[PDB]
Design a protein around this ligand. Structure first.
Ligand SMILES: CCC[C@H](C(=O)Nc1ccc(S(N)(=O)=O)cc1)C(C)(C)C
Ligand SMILES: [Zn+2]
Length: 257
C-alpha cells in the first residue's frame, strides 16, 4: 500500500495511480516573481463561526480533524470560487526537521509544515461525488514556520497522545478552526489535485501568503505520532509530504500585489 517510505513513497505512486503524472498535479513550487496579480479575484470569504468539529482520526498518513458537513456550517466562498464549499476536515503535512515538511514551496523554500483545510462544492451533494469533478474541492493551504506557539493549535497538540497509532480516533468537539488562521487572507491560487493517492485532479488550491508560527514543542509533538498500528513496530509519522510537481500548463494567480 502507498505511503511515504523508500519503497512505497511518492516516486512509486504512479504505478497504482497513473494520474500521478497528470496535467494538474499538486503540490507545486510557487514562484512568487512569476505569479500574476489578478485584480478580478475576489476576497476570500471564510465563514467558520458555526463550525462543528466532531472527531480527530489518525488514518496512518496524517491525522484528520473532521467536521459536520451535513449543513452549511463552516464554508469557504469567494476568491477564485463560484459557489459554496463546505469544510469537511483539516490535516497537516510535516517534516522530521524544521527545514522541511511543507508540500507547496515558495521560491523553492520549504516550511516546517503545511495545514490543509479541505472543502467540497455543495453543488455535488457529497464529498465522494465532489472528488470526481474538476471543481469539486477547494483546499485552503497555510504554511507553518517554527517560532512562537500558536495558541489555537494547542488543543490539537494535546489530544495527539490519544491517537498515537493508525486507526485510533478521539472525540474532538467544539474546536474552532478560526484559531489556525493568519491575519492576512492574501493568497495564491491554481488548479491542482489531491496530494495523496488517489491524486484526483479536483482541487482549486488557495495557498495563503502569510504563514502561522508554531512552537518547536508543538511540531515536536506532531513527530511523536505513528504511521503504524498499535502492536506493530514503531515508525514515526514524519515526512508525510509529497514534493513539488511540474507546473505544466498552469499559471499561478495572486490576489495581491
Ligand atoms: C477519494 C479521497 C479519499 C479520502 C480523502 O479525503 N483523501 C484526501 C487526500 C488528500 C487531500 S490533500 N493533502 O488536502 O490534497 C485531501 C483528501 C480519504 C481517503 C477517505 C481520506
Ligand atoms: Zn493535505
Amino acid at each position: 500500500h502507498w505511503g511515504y517510505g523508500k519503497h512505497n513513497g511518492p516516486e512509486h505512486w504512479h504505478k497504482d495511480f497513473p494520474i500521478a503524472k497528470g496535467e494538474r498535479q499538486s503540490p507545486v513550487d510557487i514562484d512568487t516573481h512569476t505569479a500574476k496579480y489578478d485584480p478580478s479575484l475576489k476576497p476570500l470569504s471564510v465563514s467558520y463561526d458555526q463550525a462543528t468539529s466532531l472527531r480527530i482520526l489518525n488514518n496512518g498518513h496524517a491525522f484528520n480533524v473532521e467536521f459536520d458537513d451535513s449543513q452549511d456550517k463552516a464554508v469557504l466562498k469567494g476568491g477564485p470560487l463560484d459557489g459554496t464549499y463546505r469544510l469537511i476536515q483539516f490535516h497537516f503535512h510535516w517534516g522530521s526537521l524544521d527545514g522541511q515538511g511543507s508540500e507547496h514551496t515558495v521560491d523553492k523554500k520549504k516550511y516546517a509544515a503545511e495545514l490543509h483545510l479541505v472543502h467540497w462544492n455543495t453543488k455535488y451533494g457529497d464529498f465522494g461525488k465532489a472528488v470526481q469533478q474538476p471543481d469539486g474541492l477547494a483546499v485552503l493551504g497555510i504554511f507553518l514556520k517554527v517560532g512562537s506557539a500558536k495558541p489555537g493549535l494547542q488543543k490539537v497538540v494535546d489530544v495527539l497522545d490519544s491517537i498515537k497509532t493508525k486507526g485510533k480516533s478521539a472525540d474532538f468537539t467544539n474546536f474552532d478552526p478560526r484559531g489556525l488562521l493568519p491575519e492576512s487572507l492574501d493568497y495564491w491560487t491554481y488548479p491542482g489535485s489531491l496530494t495523496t493517492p488517489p491524486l484526483l485532479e479536483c482541487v482549486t488550491w488557495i495557498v495563503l501568503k502569510e504563514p502561522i508560527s508554531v512552537s518547536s514543542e508543538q511540531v515536536l509533538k506532531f513527530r511523536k505520532l505513528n504511521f503504524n498500528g498499535e502492536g506493530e513496530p514503531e515508525e514515526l509519522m514524519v515526512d508525510n509530504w509529497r514534493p513539488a510537481q511540474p507546473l505544466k500548463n498552469r499559471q499561478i494567480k495572486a490576489s495581491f500585489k
